[PDB]
Symmetry: D2
Subunit: 324 residues, 4 copies
């Protein structure tokens, strides 16, 4: 439910997926010569390869978030109550919602290139199957340049926003998310100067009183504000393992523990998995609620010119290293 | 920095330790026949065994948090600016702050019995050499109940802890009172008694947590962790319990960069310890290695007389999946 | 600024005006036969009478807030950084922003009528004079039905929204204001049931812990959320004096004391005046920062068929009632 | 429910009184030779004159807030659930809670005087009469030096605190009120500097986003924080009428409107009256919920050598000035 683009040296793209129902997700590599059959676009027999997290149904990857081999990344996040899809129209490039990640990563390589080519796009109301109605999504798109954009189809059509904070959660519309950001302009990671009650000595009784109003709620605006802050103040100039460890810490600070986000009677949205994808090197790191150890899958260990989905387990059991 | 007692079925006692300076911590078992040289109390050559996280100086275990073989846990958290120690007094049991954890765990079994035996105690200003840091303590046991032990300018206090958690400043009664400020928080959606007769755009799940504290400061972590701990799953086996415990503490984790205690110097979560009181096992991980390790105290010669030390801080232990070793 | 429509029995429309400098506002009655010379619309030599707070420039009322004799009210509030006006166009009915309140109150009777007639409207970039550039505004329109609308011209054009909370402040765009209200759905005036830490007895050490996260800042969102709450929970079924009294207290809940809203180097926005207009009776009640005693001007005690502005002072000195004067009269 | 000491030039001492029911309060001058019968202290047949707001019962002024002719002020505020009174004892000077304001103003002139002479005081559990059991109170005391103390009798006995912010509300204990102030140390009247997300240009869409976390609730803590802020930033170097005007506005910023503070089924705590007492001049200014016009009673226009209470009406009907 929280997606970030983290640029300490290399560039890392990933997300927490928080929900109360699973969708058979696995780690799925789609090689260069798997044939995408799009609903209303020309089928691509050869295309960029990609690795990400996906459900697989009737030999089709239904990606939740992924990156391709040229350093482009796309994540889809619930947009329930905000999104609107539109019927196929005879003068636009019609991408169905479930195939947006596939189509973008198969075809383009940079955010700037995605921007120039979404100008004719319509996100259509086409669903994958009758027993799989399209879900309401909006998308974060980042690349190796450290810049990202937000893609939102709503009542007023398709919108592409520049994303100055390289993060995204759920509702409301993206310009309202950014507006809300300014309500926390006074937050600081250390201690503020006392211009609150000038001339009075306040006992600064705790460290980091400058974050006393930083949101810790499980709702979409709270996670958006906190993760923007965590991401902006995270370390830079780190090697691979340090950068990947920091990426998980960032997303861990807005994780949803079971019991805190109630969505029905004893039904809870919680952080099902976290994914971390190196854009330069094509490596997908991940963990999940039940297993905190970080696993990794490298796209280049496989034959990118093959033509079948390569599939690994996402959800794992707790992998405790016993010491004595 | 954040310590909890979690009672889903078994009982788990542990803490995040958040700071900017490390103190050579390690896992440390103290067996029954290690000789405790107490600064102003009788030497204890035979005592309960215990396991925790500690620094070892001059062959002495300086514990941050630990449990003993009877199922009593004690954790020490920073109390800077709030605590006061006092000179050794003629009429009281004088425990030095740096040895409070060792003494309480070597001597007692239940939190109830720690309460009875604290009434004549004075926490002294004696240091190790290394001056004594300002701490207060959370004490908990297998009854699922816990106490707060604070020495401040008004003397030694012991408080029943109704939320089984503790962070840093201010004094514990103020922490508890501040909780009532969050009485409207719920994990789901509230009923709209805010603007009766108006249909609110409930645009997000869990709008009931919109005012839940997420700051890195001491009151914010206390309010969040109490809520996380109170709403965590119950009636669960060992591994699931341990998994939920670590998630509770991760929700009040301090990521590098968010808590600035100096010029480009940051307080962050250095390690997370989780200790099963029934089974004497210490699970832990640290900032650089997210994989949980375990040490079982009962798989050692608890009759020995030397300290058994293991490593705490480990490198990231990644599990590479598509190694193509084709075994 | 904060504007509200309040409906205990009669219907009361009005606002706080919060700012750092005054514009010569007075109480101004525009009678039925004052000739409105609009910028790109036909003049209206006969029209509804209206009373409100306005600046007078070249014998022209420049209303900040007013009501007309038929019980319609319009208030203009700062929309700086969100509003946009558009060049005059032939495909549309062009109303300049400085004349929106005058034109609507001269011409229309009800919020419904206003809605129907805004469907072809353009808020133009025309200014009263080359030397009085047009400020950025949005408007609250309410009437005796107890319903109101919000009128906003922004980047994407003109918009008219039903206002379910009968209040308005400044930025952001009105849909975003309503969204932000949901962030406070847990607020109650009394004490909440403890679903926070079930099983823990939390001492409710203060009354009204349910309002502990109610916003008190001077910013636009804070004042919007607080005044919506104040207005929703205010008493009903009151008679005249009682209703006016509660109206002023509602707007008082979000007033700006000097010193708390710094808008420039030692420059402060503060509540300059508060206006309360009975839609049914044509009576304008007011006080101001320096005088808390309420004053009243009845439109209907005046000759409404005439054609010159009838003008009364708005800002007054503090009007203190000295009790033990011992004039022993 | 909120009391302040305001020091723009002269010194002003006063309070909002918020509650759900009135106790027949009036403006009451007690002249120098009205005889006080104290429960456990010698009668004072002559003493300082005082003016304030009081319930009168059996020809006794039961003050809620008042000032004396030497420029000392005391205000009693509800302390329910925190305060404790103790049985009369021989070892101490026993002041009953209902008489605390009268005894202090009759006997002393400065806050320093009060501080010294409280070192042997017990606030007793004695009640004024069987029909009026003692309510739980704590007190703000201020004088013409511009400084104030807080007097609190709780579980651990009597406490006197210097008050750095010259304000007081209800629970919790005063050192906890002070500690909570530091949680708002980043609040500013204007725009903060963006140390929140460095490198990002936040759109500052509203004036005064620095007050976005200033409390506006009706609870005791919220009103305390906001009134400290209003009082700290209020104008200075003003003459009489401007100072009174700002004094009422300071207290209006934490006014309790009917409907916002529910204390039972359709029972509301609201701001019943506001008093503003000039310490130098002995003038009591007031208004009330039903009448926003300010009224004034001047102590020094009465014969302060008399011995009967001089009473004036406090609650008044809305006094509207009809212009035409
Ligand atoms: C519920 C969850 C988002 C909650 C957060 O915000 C985080 C979303 C994110 C990605 C979604 C899947 C995308 C691929 C197809 C598309 C098809 O249209 C429906 C099935 C499927 C698998 C989607 C299911 C579900 O909607 C997913 C997992
Ligand atoms: C997160 C937080 O509260 C920081 C606490 C941290 C700085 C404390 C916690 C335990 C302390 C050590 C206990 C043992 C010993 C005691 C001695 O008096 C000083 C030296 C030791 C190692 C303490 C150091 C430090 O204050 C520790 C780690
Ligand atoms: C509290 C707040 O929102 C401030 C609003 C305030 C500064 C506005 C509100 C009405 C404006 C006047 C309308 C009439 C006229 C219009 C003309 O374009 C410019 C001059 C006038 C007097 C406006 C001045 C100012 O923007 C006013 C008062
Ligand atoms: C806003 C707030 O804190 C409410 C306080 C309010 C209800 C208190 C304040 C002063 C109290 C009276 C003092 C005099 C007398 C004392 C006696 O023990 C009981 C009766 C009196 C009149 C008190 C009533 C009430 O508690 C008052 C008004
Ligand atoms: Ni006279």
């Amino acid at each position: 439910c929280t997606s970030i683009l983290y640029s300490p040296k290399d560039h890392y793209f990933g997300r927490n997926l928080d929900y109360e129902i699973a969708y058979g997700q696995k780690v799925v590599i789609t090689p260069r010569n798997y044939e995408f059959k799009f609903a209303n676009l020309p089928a691509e027999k050869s295309h960029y390869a990609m690795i990400g997290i996906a459900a697989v149904a009737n030999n089709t990857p239904l990606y939740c978030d992924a990156i391709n081999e040229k350093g482009l990344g796309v994540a889809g996040l619930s947009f329930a109550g905000q999104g609107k899809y539109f019927p196929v129209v005879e003068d636009k490039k019609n991408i169905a919602s479930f195939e947006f990640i596939s189509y973008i990563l198969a075809t383009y390589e940079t955010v700037d290139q995605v921007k120039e080519n979404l100008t004719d796009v319509n996100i259509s109301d086409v669903s994958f199957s009758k027993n799989t109605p399209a879900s309401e999504l909006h998308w974060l798109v980042g690349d190796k340049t450290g810049k990202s954009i937000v893609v939102e189809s709503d009542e007023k059509g398709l919108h592409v926003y520049d994303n100055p904070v390289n993060a995204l959660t759920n509702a409301p519309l993206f310009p309202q998310q950014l507006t809300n950001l300014a309500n926390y302009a006074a937050v600081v990671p250390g201690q503020p100067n006392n211009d609150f009650l000038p001339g009075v000595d306040l006992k600064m009784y705790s460290r980091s009183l400058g974050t006393h109003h930083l949101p810790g709620g499980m709702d979409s605006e709270s996670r958006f504000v906190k993760v923007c802050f965590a991401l902006n103040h995270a370390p830079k100039d780190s090697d691979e393992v340090e950068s990947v460890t920091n990426f998980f810490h960032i997303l861990q600070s807005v994780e949803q523990v079971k019991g805190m986000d109630e969505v029905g009677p004893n039904i809870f949205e919680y952080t099902m998995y976290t994914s971390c994808m190196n854009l330069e090197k094509g490596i997908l790191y991940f963990n999940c609620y039940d297993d905190s150890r970080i696993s990794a899958v490298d796209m280049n260990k496989e034959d990118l010119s093959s033509s079948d989905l390569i599939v690994f387990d996402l959800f794992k059991k707790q992998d405790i290293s016993f010491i004595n």
